[PDB]
Design a protein around this nucleic acid. Sequence first.
RNA 1: UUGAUGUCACGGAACAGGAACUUGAACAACAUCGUUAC
RNA 2: UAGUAACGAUGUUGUUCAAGUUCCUGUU
Length: 1536
Amino acid sequence: MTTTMKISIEFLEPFRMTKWQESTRRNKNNKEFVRGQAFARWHRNKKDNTKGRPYITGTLLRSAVIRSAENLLTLSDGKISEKTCCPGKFDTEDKDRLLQLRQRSTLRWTDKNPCPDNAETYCPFCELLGRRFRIHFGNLSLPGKPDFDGPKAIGSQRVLNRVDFKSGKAHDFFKAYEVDHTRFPRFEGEITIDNKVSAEARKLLCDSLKFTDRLCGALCVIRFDNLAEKTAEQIISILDDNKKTEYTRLLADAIRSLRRSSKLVAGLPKDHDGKDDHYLWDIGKKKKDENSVTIRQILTTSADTKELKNAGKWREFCEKLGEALYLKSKDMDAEFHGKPDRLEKSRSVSIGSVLKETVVCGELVAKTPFFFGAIDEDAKQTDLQVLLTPDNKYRLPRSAVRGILRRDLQTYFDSPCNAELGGRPCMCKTCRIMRGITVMDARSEYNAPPEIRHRTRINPFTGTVAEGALFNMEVAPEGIVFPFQLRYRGSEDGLPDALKTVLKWWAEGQAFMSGAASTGKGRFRMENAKYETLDLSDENQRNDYLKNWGWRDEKGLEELKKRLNSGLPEPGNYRDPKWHEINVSIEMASPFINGDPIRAAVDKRGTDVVTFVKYKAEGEEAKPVCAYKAESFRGVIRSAVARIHMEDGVPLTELTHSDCECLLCQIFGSEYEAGKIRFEDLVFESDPEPVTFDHVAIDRFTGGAADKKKFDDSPLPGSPARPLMLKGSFWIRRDVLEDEEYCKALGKALADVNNGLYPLGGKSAIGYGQVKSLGIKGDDKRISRLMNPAFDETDVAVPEKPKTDAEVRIEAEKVYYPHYFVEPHKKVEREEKPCGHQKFHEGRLTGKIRCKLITKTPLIVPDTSNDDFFRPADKEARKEKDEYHKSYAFFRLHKQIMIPGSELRGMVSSVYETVTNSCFRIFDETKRLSWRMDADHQNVLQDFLPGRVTADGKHIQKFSETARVPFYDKTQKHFDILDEQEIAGEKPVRMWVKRFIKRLSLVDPAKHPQKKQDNKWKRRKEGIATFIEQKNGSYYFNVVTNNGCTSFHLWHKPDNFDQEKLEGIQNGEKLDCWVRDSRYQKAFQEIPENDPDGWECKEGYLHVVGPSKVEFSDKKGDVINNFQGTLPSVPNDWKTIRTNDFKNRKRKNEPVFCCEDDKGNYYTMAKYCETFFFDLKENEEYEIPEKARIKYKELLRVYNNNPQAVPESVFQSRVARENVEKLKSGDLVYFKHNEKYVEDIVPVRISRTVDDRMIGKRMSADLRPCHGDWRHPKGLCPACRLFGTGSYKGRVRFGFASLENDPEWLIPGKNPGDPFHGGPVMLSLLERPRPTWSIPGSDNKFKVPGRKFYVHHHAWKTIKDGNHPTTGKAIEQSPNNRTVEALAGGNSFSFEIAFENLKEWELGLLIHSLQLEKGLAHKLGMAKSMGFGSVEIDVESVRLRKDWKQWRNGNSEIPNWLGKGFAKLKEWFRDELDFIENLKKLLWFPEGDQAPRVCYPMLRKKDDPNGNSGYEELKDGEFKKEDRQKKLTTPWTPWA
RNA sequence: UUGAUGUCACGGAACAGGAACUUGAACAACAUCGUUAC
RNA sequence: UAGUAACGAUGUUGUUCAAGUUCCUGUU
């Protein structure tokens, strides 16, 4: 007796979902079951397990149908078809149930009796209301009834908000689930109607089902009828198998960046030679073990797997791989909800019968990168994320649009709302308009990943970043189009005036929707607006509206968009939007950098930092453009304001801004109110291609490149020819331009920015940034009227340089050395506190110094961007893999000769820090030294005893003595009778050892005429002689010693005098003879066939090392000559090398072995013997500490990395040939010990000795790098206060020097008429320095000398011709020297030095270090160990700064500064200023007719035509061991 | 998997504050091998 | 029982980033 009607709803927007709770907190007393009643619910079967499906109750649809029926019944004056309708009853006497009452002011029509219950025929509204069921409403569920695994598998919980209006920051908040509508767009159910309900109630029900449009926070229309985890584990295991475990976070941040495209893995950078050993992209490979994959190979084979071919799959793989790597690198409260008021009776009111409808279509594009915070969980790498769609599309929610309409409607009026989330609806002017507004979501169809930005926070006391202030941020691209649709229904004749004014504001590009609006985030603009007003008051238009469900669906919208008239309606009352745009145009004069290291790690150029580049969208694809961040510009202007204004004593950079109305707190805002000025990004107006500059860090002692300290950067190029314009804008509020107190502050700050201070960008300490001018427009001269400069234009001249007094006595026919260290003092002061990079102090100076550099000796500053600049034309370009002859040019920026700022910074820093006797800025406190020990028995080789380590690596057992066993000879055979188990020393052998051999001579007492002078004939006694056999040269004898106790057989070689005693031998005569003993320490295997004497059989260990001591050469040495032809070839394996020739041929002395390889090398090999350790003394061992093992490790590392070694791997020793690492267990060593503790372990007889301490502990404790903690503390060296350090910014900025006259090169070029290119000159070898010649020994006597200042001379006239400086031979090219292009003497440059917050004695010392006396000169450039690079600097106008208006050129104050600097220098050191005298002696320039000839020695004396006693004779006599330091300190000592 | 005579949740902007920055001459002379003889 | 004496040859590149901070303050 029923009739089922099947309905089905279909969503057009993401609906919302509530949270599940058990059936105990489901009363009217819970505050989360209420406020969760207007959403969809989540049912789970088998309670306590999150598994179920969503559903919508029937009571909610009943309430929506009731509300639509009330809204529809007053539109036809209460008559459905024929009969009038009763007003209905909404009163209930019981209120313990009915968990929620109605607070709505029910509509009215035809007020009459409420049709009491004791009736028999009701009003159709009472049949719809339900007065066994009359109209039963059923549950709506999913079509197929599936089962998901929880509420997080269909949706995502996001946080909503509730912001304030005056202090526009926040209030409480809440959160809810939202499910996307592209995955779950359909729900189904039915409605059970009785038979005898009516024939007019069904029409009302159908019209009410068609008139309802939203159910759960969304529009609707109701109708009726495993790789990434294992790859992460593999990469982590690779990083842990090696020692590169500190590159894990950079690897994570660089791998997450590859999610943009898969064509970036085949374009990762390489090394500088084009190899495949990058420092992070090639971790894992070794010298051996080819089956070792790297990270580049892992990313390459994972780029083509037929699973990661799509973009979404590759993006997801990159994201979760980066997340896993970040998580692996890691481990090394206020919310309101509800409270609705339970009102007893609703105040029923009438609204009338006039109802219209307005549709506004169009679209709104983005003009700046927008931001919508959707920071979710389970993703902790970015910590500031954006809102995305489940298919990675950008969207703007309707909550943000609704809140922004609310804010603009409150701003159009001048009265905020005062609602408190409860009770009767609010009835102000801005809540009667907001109750008829309906908007929609967007999708933007872009589908591209967002870029990541890095931000920091700077401590304004030191200048560096604060502790713990570093975070990321991701922003959406610029230029995305969102579809827009607004709909309003009310009683007016169209739109109101407030909405028309707000839409006219939005049509001018002033719709600041959401984001970090203070730093120039999303600003949209509504375009292509259409509108059309319907009329639901009549009946011929309402039925056509109800026939097609309005026009909400896609077909209805495509039919509606053909009826809308174009152009928005003009408002009746305009309001002049409250934001004003001001343009900004900056022009620079130097390079510019805005760091980005991750892009440098992914980029294929192979640099360390690259400039910042943002993307922009063109509809489906993104293109990059270089720009300047908005946060950096905002920070610059904020710091420029904060350092001038006082506000009651303490400046604005020291306040806490807790509850203060400071001047920064009222313009730039704080954590309690929003700001009133919004900046924006700055584009560069052109296409500047980045260039590459190389840098290095020159050590102080042994001035050369320090270890691990070579780097580069890729900034944008700018020069006084092409000035790198910058364009942008920023927005200010309307009620700030009208104030006269804030505009003055902004004008003062921009006037300080314009006058040269506050450089923009990165490394401004070497001449980057340097704003030349700044000009704003668009403000009617309210701010740009205080930005006018004002100088003095005086005529005071600059005082001339004083005359020098330190002179040297240089004579002819003598040579000099070029090093001459400068020994320092012993008192470096660190008892002063640094100033602080805050407000400009009162008694300190700030300004500019303009200098003038003029060269007087050829200068070389190379342009290391390319080699082969002097390459011949019209030939082959270059072979792939070879070592050619490098040749460079001079430095150019835009085809203009320049000198960088870091060169001058380093030079002046060295001179300034050696004047004030300050801390060694950069130093190498590692790398302990080592020396080869000499070959003399008494001094060194006496203490090294033979030994052997025990079964465990803890003790060394010593031996008694040694004897040498002959190998590689022709008089025995020891290789084919001993196996490999006994020649490696792991098994004892048994040899026969002889100690003393016996010579023979016939006449002892009557031998004084000929012999008996050698004094060795003092142990002869007597002896009888026999004869048993005849030989060719020798004769047999059987001699007794004193009484016939023993007899020995020997072979005696007679001589002239012996010949006569020989003459007759009948085998039986008794000759007279004498026996003498001589030393013979040999040990053979069996027995030799020449001495059948008593050999003492002993027991010991044997060990071999291989054929060492090769005198290889290239010029047919004295032993290869006078040979017997046909030299053999090199054998491919040892144990077969024999003796070829003898060194002495009269006697049978030392044997050699001459061979010849495929090249022109000629080897001559000594060492025809090996050593045998016998007589192992037990029960006496010595322990090995850790210092011995560290010394042994350094010894092995030196042995294995040697470029001067023998090219053949057969003639090396065992230590270097087999490449071993640690001390094994059971190997022979030569150790040194004293009282149970060993000191040194060497492998061979004559090896090298490593010193115990490092080189950092051979100085004083005060001269070490003045770095560390010992606001900032007071422990800083006097040179780390002018120039910076880590955790303290320096207050001196240098600048790019530029040439102004004509070049005037050294040698003319190849093309006449083009005076802008020079000719090439070829240099000498230029080999790296040796610190093992200044520190000769290692005990305690040799400390570290000074700072290695090179002397001035003229030795470039010999290189100009083509000879060598030491000899006179012509130099020949090779793949080890360069061919540079140089300038000549008589060129002029000009640069500028900016300083701030200096004292009056630091400026005097800086001027004394810039300009020297009138007889000295500086030295910069390349190859200044010859005569190359000699400059002098003259100082021009020194214009100071005293206020933000006037600058007061102070040329007339220099001598007071110089006197104060000298007075401070006298105060520190009383009368011990000898280091300044030495430094003035070392900077002396030969004024005239003096030609000091300096050069380095040669190796020996026989290889230079002058014969000047090279290094191998200078180690004895002059520079022996104790005069080295002394003779290298005196500024001009004769080279001898 | 809801209750019926009463749901303005299209009744609520994840908003407000923060300088990828600090320090650094692209430079530079004496070492490397071990034993041989009595 | 036991150790004493210092000699012979002339050739060759190296570093290519390092030390720091890598997240906080708050809504009623």
